[PDB]
Ligand binder design. Sequence first.
Ligand SMILES: *[C@@H]1O[C@H](CO)[C@@H](O[C@@H]2O[C@H](CO)[C@@H](O[C@@H]3O[C@H](CO)[C@@H](O)[C@H](O)[C@@H]3O)[C@H](O)[C@H]2NC(C)=O)[C@H](O)[C@H]1NC(C)=O
Ligand SMILES: *[C@@H]1O[C@H](CO)[C@@H](O[C@@H]2O[C@H](CO)[C@@H](O)[C@H](O)[C@H]2NC(C)=O)[C@H](O)[C@H]1NC(C)=O
Ligand SMILES: *[C@@H]1O[C@H](CO)[C@@H](O)[C@H](O)[C@H]1NC(C)=O
Ligand SMILES: *[C@@H]1O[C@H](CO)[C@@H](O)[C@H](O)[C@H]1NC(C)=O
Lengths: 162, 54, 54, 236, 58
Amino acid sequence: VSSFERFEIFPKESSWPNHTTTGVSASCSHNGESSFYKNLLWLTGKNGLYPNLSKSYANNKEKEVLVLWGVHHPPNIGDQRALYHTENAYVSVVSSHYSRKFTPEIAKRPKVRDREGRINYYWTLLEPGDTIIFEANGNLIAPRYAFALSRGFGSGIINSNA
Amino acid sequence: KSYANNKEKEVLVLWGVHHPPNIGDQRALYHTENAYVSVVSSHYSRKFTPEIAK
Amino acid sequence: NCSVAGWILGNPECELLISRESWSYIVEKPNPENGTCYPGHFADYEELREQLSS
Amino acid sequence: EIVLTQSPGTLSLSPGERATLSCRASQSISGYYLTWYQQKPGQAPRLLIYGASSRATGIPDRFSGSGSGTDFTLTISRLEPEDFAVYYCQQYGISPVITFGGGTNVEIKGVQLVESGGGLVQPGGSLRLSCAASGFTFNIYDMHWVRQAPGKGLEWVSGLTTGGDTSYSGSVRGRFSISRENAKNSLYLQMNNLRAGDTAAYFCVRGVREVGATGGDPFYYAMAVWGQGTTVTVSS
Amino acid sequence: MNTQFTAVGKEFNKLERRMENLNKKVDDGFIDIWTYNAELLVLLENERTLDFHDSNVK
Ligand SMILES: *[C@@H]1O[C@H](CO)[C@@H](O[C@@H]2O[C@H](CO)[C@@H](O[C@@H]3O[C@H](CO)[C@@H](O)[C@H](O)[C@@H]3O)[C@H](O)[C@H]2NC(C)=O)[C@H](O)[C@H]1NC(C)=O
Ligand SMILES: *[C@@H]1O[C@H](CO)[C@@H](O[C@@H]2O[C@H](CO)[C@@H](O)[C@H](O)[C@H]2NC(C)=O)[C@H](O)[C@H]1NC(C)=O
Ligand SMILES: *[C@@H]1O[C@H](CO)[C@@H](O)[C@H](O)[C@H]1NC(C)=O
Ligand SMILES: *[C@@H]1O[C@H](CO)[C@@H](O)[C@H](O)[C@H]1NC(C)=O
């Protein structure tokens, strides 16, 4: 670290009116009470009303940025229809250097912390000046908060129980 | 289309994959919203199916 | 003579040799005769061989 | 959340008849937003229809609806004397506040929850209820406590998401207080400052799958399942 | 010596065994080299220390 901090790239309020945002899950819990990762958001349709999205951001802060999102893999289809109302998956997270799309399906898996479902997590740096775009037909984890930063040098990592 | 070496020297090859900023190009030129390309060799091979990305 | 593909996959001209449960080191030639009788790209040959270093 | 208007709150019709019922709100309200119930007096509610079209489990094919925006509608293809019942109109606010139509009597002319503690207290008084769970994961679902005066329109006393965002009505709030326990598989409702408006039969209600979990469990934005309820009364 | 502001360690998956066994071979390479050279230097410089003393007294 030379600088590292957390800010609110897209506030939960007012970034996503047209998708219901307040879904969480129960393995992700707090003192035996359900929850979800602070930095991030679910999105689903407004009472089964999924519109599809295109959003973006580019740096104004002039510091480097770190960004995170997710790609939804249900364990069953009735979720996929009920939330997002498309068997089609197509997402496009785009930048200048990096860009990638995602078109997954339902892939059943075994219980792991009582979860067959999966969301594969995906991430990138973003420098000053460069833009990110999201586009999607759903199946997403969206950034609420993102990590502003500078680089660092030479510091590192330990595993230790001392 | 294709090619294989007759020269008996090694070769270096280059191409590109089109990403319009707007669709009216894509229809006007190529007349398909579908993209599908397949550049193929023995060891290497890859396909490409992009979209309009503003 | 065999390539590793002819070894691992079960090329009948390559002796399978299930008896060979573990060994000291691997012996090949530089230019193994028996690659795949039905061709097809084989990815991560390097990584596999490293995994089968020992 | 918005005031509703059922149409009609009672009707009297003969066998071998349809029955058109229109529950409409102030504003236009998005369509997979309502769910439709019945109840026999003496029985708990049962689930029928959701999102103005689609149909629940363990069913004939006769109760079928339509409508969108401001005006939602459940129609009925055939009437029968086994249907002698009050039907309800229960909608999930975007303000997460369930709102209730006031019951619609059809007159025909010629796994589980368990509640705990219902009974009497004095007015202005203090008492608690509990519920307890059986054979599921009380972790997941968004829970609701509900009330019902006898042969009356319901009122939604409270609900809470498992993330902890409460929702009450502005009159009821403060005088009631909830608390949830998942490792214990049980629910609690301590209650104080109690007047005759609480003279009614209450229900513990298991609702909506939050986002994510293993199961062969779909969700709707309707209820999941009811409880058998219990009476509560103030008197002297 | 010049000791940098250093971070030694790394870690990998099992689809990176080349880099793993490499970086093992790398670092063990160096450790053995520094080990070897330094140990020789201790032996030699203590021997030369005795010879330094021996010369001075003589
Ligand atoms: C294992 O390796 C041996 C040695 O490389 C393979 O045998 C050789 O395969 C080549 C393939 O081109 C043969 O050449 C061909 O011969 C046929 C006639 O048989 C002809 O139609 C082709 O135009 C070409 O000339 C070569 O004769 C053959 N030599 C011997 C000694 O067998 C063998 O096929 C490999 N087997 C497997 C299972 O990989
Ligand atoms: C390895 O490859 C050589 C090719 O040089 C094979 O040699 C053949 O051997 C047979 C008898 O076994 C002869 O009839 C052929 O004339 C030989 N061919 C050549 C080109 O020399 C050898 O048999 C192979 N060995 C194995 C184990 O695969
Ligand atoms: C939601 O969609 C409506 C379409 O009429 C639009 O007016 C509104 O700005 C949209 N809001 C967002 C957050 O996309
Ligand atoms: C959503 O995707 C479908 C797929 O063809 C497209 O027709 C529609 O216009 C998209 N809607 C939005 C709001 O992007």
